Amino acid sequence: RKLCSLDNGDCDQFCHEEQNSVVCSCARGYTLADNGKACIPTGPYPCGKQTLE
């Protein structure tokens, strides 16, 4: 277990080892956070979220 194999590289969603090392990204409607790991919803109903409201 190295990069993306170790806890998905700490990424929220998509993980890629671009020329060694982890590179996280997000699905449409999400914007990668400042830490370059977390994914932030762009609106009221981001994909893949069970509707709480």
Swiss-Prot record:
Superkingdom per UniProt: Eukaryota
Residue pairs linked by disulfide bridges in the UniProt entry: C4-C15, C11-C24, C26-C39
EGF-like domain location: 1-40
Name of the featured protein: Factor X light chain
Organism the protein comes from: Homo sapiens (Human)
Section of the entire sequence shown: 126 to 178 of 488
